[PDB]
Amino acid sequence: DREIKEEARKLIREAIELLQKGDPRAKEILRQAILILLAIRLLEEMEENIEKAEKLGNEELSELAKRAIKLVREALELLKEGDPRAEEILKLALKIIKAILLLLEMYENIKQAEELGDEDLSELAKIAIRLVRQALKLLQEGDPRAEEILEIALRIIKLILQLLFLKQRIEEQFVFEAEEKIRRIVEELFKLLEG
Amino acid sequence: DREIKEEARKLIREAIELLQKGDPRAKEILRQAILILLAIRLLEEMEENIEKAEKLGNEELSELAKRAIKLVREALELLKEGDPRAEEILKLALKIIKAILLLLEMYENIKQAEELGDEDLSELAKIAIRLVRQALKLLQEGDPRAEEILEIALRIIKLILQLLFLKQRIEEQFVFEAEEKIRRIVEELFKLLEG
Amino acid sequence: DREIKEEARKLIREAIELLQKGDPRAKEILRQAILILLAIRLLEEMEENIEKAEKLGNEELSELAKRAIKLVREALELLKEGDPRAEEILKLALKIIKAILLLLEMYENIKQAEELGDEDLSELAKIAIRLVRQALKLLQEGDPRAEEILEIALRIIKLILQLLFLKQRIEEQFVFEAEEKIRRIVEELFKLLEG
Amino acid sequence: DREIKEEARKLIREAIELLQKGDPRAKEILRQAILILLAIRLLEEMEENIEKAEKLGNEELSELAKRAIKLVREALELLKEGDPRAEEILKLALKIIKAILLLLEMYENIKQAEELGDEDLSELAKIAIRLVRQALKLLQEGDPRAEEILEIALRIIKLILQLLFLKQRIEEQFVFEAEEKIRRIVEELFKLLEG
Numbered sequence: 001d002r003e004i005k006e007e008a009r010k011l012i013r014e015a016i017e018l019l020q021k022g023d024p025r026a027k028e029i030l031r032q033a034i035l036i037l038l039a040i041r042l043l044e045e046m047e048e049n050i051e052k053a054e055k056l057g058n059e060e061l062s063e064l065a066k067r068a069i070k071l072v073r074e075a076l077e078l079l080k081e082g083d084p085r086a087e088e089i090l091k092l093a094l095k096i097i098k099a100i101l102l103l104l105e106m107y108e109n110i111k112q113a114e115e116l117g118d119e120d121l122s123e124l125a126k127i128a129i130r131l132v133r134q135a136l137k138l139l140q141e142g143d144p145r146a147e148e149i150l151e152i153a154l155r156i157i158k159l160i161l162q163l164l165f166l167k168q169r170i171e172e173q174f175v176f177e178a179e180e181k182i183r184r185i186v187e188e189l190f191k192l193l194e195g
Numbered sequence: 196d197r198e199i200k201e202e203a204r205k206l207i208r209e210a211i212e213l214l215q216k217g218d219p220r221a222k223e224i225l226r227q228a229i230l231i232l233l234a235i236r237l238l239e240e241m242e243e244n245i246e247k248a249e250k251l252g253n254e255e256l257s258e259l260a261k262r263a264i265k266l267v268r269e270a271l272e273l274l275k276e277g278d279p280r281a282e283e284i285l286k287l288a289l290k291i292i293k294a295i296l297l298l299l300e301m302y303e304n305i306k307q308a309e310e311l312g313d314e315d316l317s318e319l320a321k322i323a324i325r326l327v328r329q330a331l332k333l334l335q336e337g338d339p340r341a342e343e344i345l346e347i348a349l350r351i352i353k354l355i356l357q358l359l360f361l362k363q364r365i366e367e368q369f370v371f372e373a374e375e376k377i378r379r380i381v382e383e384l385f386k387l388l389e390g
Numbered sequence: 391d392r393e394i395k396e397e398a399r400k401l402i403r404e405a406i407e408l409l410q411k412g413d414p415r416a417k418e419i420l421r422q423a424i425l426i427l428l429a430i431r432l433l434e435e436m437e438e439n440i441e442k443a444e445k446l447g448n449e450e451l452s453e454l455a456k457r458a459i460k461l462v463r464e465a466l467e468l469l470k471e472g473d474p475r476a477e478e479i480l481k482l483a484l485k486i487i488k489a490i491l492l493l494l495e496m497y498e499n500i501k502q503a504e505e506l507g508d509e510d511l512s513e514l515a516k517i518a519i520r521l522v523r524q525a526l527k528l529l530q531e532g533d534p535r536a537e538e539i540l541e542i543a544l545r546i547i548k549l550i551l552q553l554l555f556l557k558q559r560i561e562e563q564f565v566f567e568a569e570e571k572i573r574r575i576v577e578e579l580f581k582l583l584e585g
Numbered sequence: 586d587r588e589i590k591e592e593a594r595k596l597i598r599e600a601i602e603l604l605q606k607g608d609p610r611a612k613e614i615l616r617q618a619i620l621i622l623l624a625i626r627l628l629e630e631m632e633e634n635i636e637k638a639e640k641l642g643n644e645e646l647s648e649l650a651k652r653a654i655k656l657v658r659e660a661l662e663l664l665k666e667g668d669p670r671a672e673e674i675l676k677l678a679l680k681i682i683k684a685i686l687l688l689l690e691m692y693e694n695i696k697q698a699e700e701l702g703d704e705d706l707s708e709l710a711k712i713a714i715r716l717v718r719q720a721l722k723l724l725q726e727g728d729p730r731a732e733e734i735l736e737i738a739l740r741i742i743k744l745i746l747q748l749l750f751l752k753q754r755i756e757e758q759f760v761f762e763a764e765e766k767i768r769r770i771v772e773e774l775f776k777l778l779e780g
Binding site for chain 2: 399
């Protein structure tokens with residue numbers, strides 16, 4: 001990754017310190033540089049979240065993490081060469097890793113659900129995890145449906161988290177915000193699924 | 196209800212574990228499944244809120260709850276078969292139950308107003324309750340005006356709650372946010388009523 | 391006012407308990423009733439805010455209050471008869487009274503500024519007060535410019551309050567929100583004044 | 586500056602106390618007056634923030650401040666005469682000074698990063714500072730790209746601050762809001778850079 005950080009630093013130097021006197025298009029190079037910086041930070045944190053996953057003891061999430069990591073690094077290596085499709089792939093891969101970290105947070109929360117026995121949330125989260133797996137699989141295959149399924153994965157994950165935070169506040173008007181926002185999430189989810 | 200939860204689980208299974216290899220339209224089935232899950236949770240909480248209502252000793256709200264419950268369950272049984280109108284009816288019924296739970300919260304608050312003697316809010320709330328009754332009645336009749344009246348019911352209920360929270364703040368700039376949001380609600384209410 | 395409250399109650403009764411069996415247009419009457427209720431409450435609070443004004447010892451604000459009160463009551467009496475223009479006039483009068491209460495809050499705050507010697511805010515607030523006076527005068531004349539000037543009055547008042555809250559937080563990132571919202575208010579104010 | 590404040594007071598007097606009887610266009614003069622008031626306050630605070638900068642011991646920021654101050658004062662003197670381009674130039678100059686104060690806040694925060702050794706943020710901030718320098722330079726030259734570069738300067742600065750506040754939260758769901766907001770900032774930044 002450090003090599004990638006150095007490549008990013010070179011990109012930023014060319015984009016600004018050199019390119020200020022040159023083509024205004026250098027905004028492209030600047031974009032690539034900042035993108036690489038965000039990606040590097042994201043992977044840096046995710047590699048510790050992998051230790052989290054292993055101590056959380058779910059192999060599905062660990063595989064998700066590892067495949068996503070390799071996806072991102074492959075995308076970075078391709079971007080080092082070019083292939084504008086690398087832009088789309090890198091954005092998608094970062095969104096995926098975002099979703100996987102969010103998944104680990106969700107899973108740690110769902111420990112609470114298991115303690116409660118909210119089997120409804122359990123099955124729903126199972127579908128969510130498998131959905132993310134399907135999105136990762138499609139992305140590995142390059143199917144444009146990667147985004148289409150991923151967005152539904154995200155929306156189900158946010159809904160689940162919303163219900164978990166509502167449950168915790170129940171354990172504690174302070175519940176009104178959730179009763180509202182869950183409705184926007186629900187209707188956006190329906191809008192995506194229905195058309 | 197549990198049978199309904201099991202039906203929902205079957206729906207999700209067909210929608211994802213099977214349908215991943217098949218028609219992308221499975222988003223429809225997924226939508227139905229998640230919808231059923233939300234509905235089941237909502238009724239589960241509402242059946243306790245019925246005991247709340249009875250201890251609150253208002254028969255109008257109790258009848259509202261019971262008829263809404265039966266509406267929702269009828270809609271679920273229909274959805275088990277099909278009839279795309281089941282989608283509209285189920286959405287409306289859930290919004291209605293939302294409004295009735297909100298009503299119980301409002302009524303418990305309006306206990307404060309009765310202590311104060313805010314007869315203005317009392318009469319206004321009476322109109323709101325009867326409005327909800329009218330919306331439920333129309334929905335029972337299937338008149339498309341169900342949504343039109345229901346939306347006004349909701350907006351009046353939110354306004355009433357806003358004034359109650361303003362009153363509590365008065366018992367307590369911290370009042371500014373209410374002064375703004377009441378204005379937005381008021382002008383949206385007028386926009387609906389006037390056109 | 392109490393007679394007006396009773397008239398409002400009659401309006402709501404005709405609008406709902408009677409009108410449910412009749413013309414769906416009853417939303418108009420419902421709107422009028424809710425409007426009258428809001429106005430009643432607003433004047434009820436403002437009459438005590440007049441005592442506030444007199445203890446604050448500014449005759450300009452006191453005259454503003456008295457003329458606005460008479461405006462609102464005249465509009466109510468007109469509405470009792472009809473003349474759809476009463477709708478516009480009543481809305482404007484309520485917004486004006488809102489602005490005058492806001493002014494009293496602003497003046498009490500500006501006591502702090504006088505203690506500080508923020509003569510800039512002092513002169514700006516002078517312009518704001520005179521602007522409100524001009525809007526009230528035009529409204530008394532029925533000039534359509536009443537709204538056009540009033541909106542600028544409001545926006546200057548909000549800006550002034552924003553600077554006062556910023557000053558207090560200065561006495562106290564917790565200042566970032568003001569740095570943003572002042573910018574939005576400023577650019578909206580410019581958009582209104584410039585076109 | 587005080588002379589400018591007095592000129593602004595004269596502008597407001599002509600715009601309101603005189604102009605109420607005539608040309609509705611006086612909104613222009615009112616706009617100019619309020620604009621001058623904001624500018625004067627801004628410079629008044631920035632001159633102390635210059636002492637901050639010198640105690641912070643960065644000559645780049647000190648030059649930024651001094652050149653921006655002179656820019657603003659030149660623009661004020663021009664606006665005293667006319668040349669509607671003074672409007673654009675003064676708006677840009679104020680946004681620049683805003684960005685420079687924000688920079689000083691960012692730099693004081695980045696003291697934390699230097700303590701941590703977040704060389705990524707360090708290099709990124711270097712690019713941000715040089716970008717602001719470039720925007721100031723172009724503006725001094727009158728190149729219309731002043732705004733185009735400045736906006737990217739601002740967006741990178743906000744992103745950097747967002748990451749610093751996230752880092753502090755890390756030293757402290759409470760992290761969820763940042764994980765959300767950084768995404769909007771990032772995608773807006775990309776939208777600007779990419780088109």
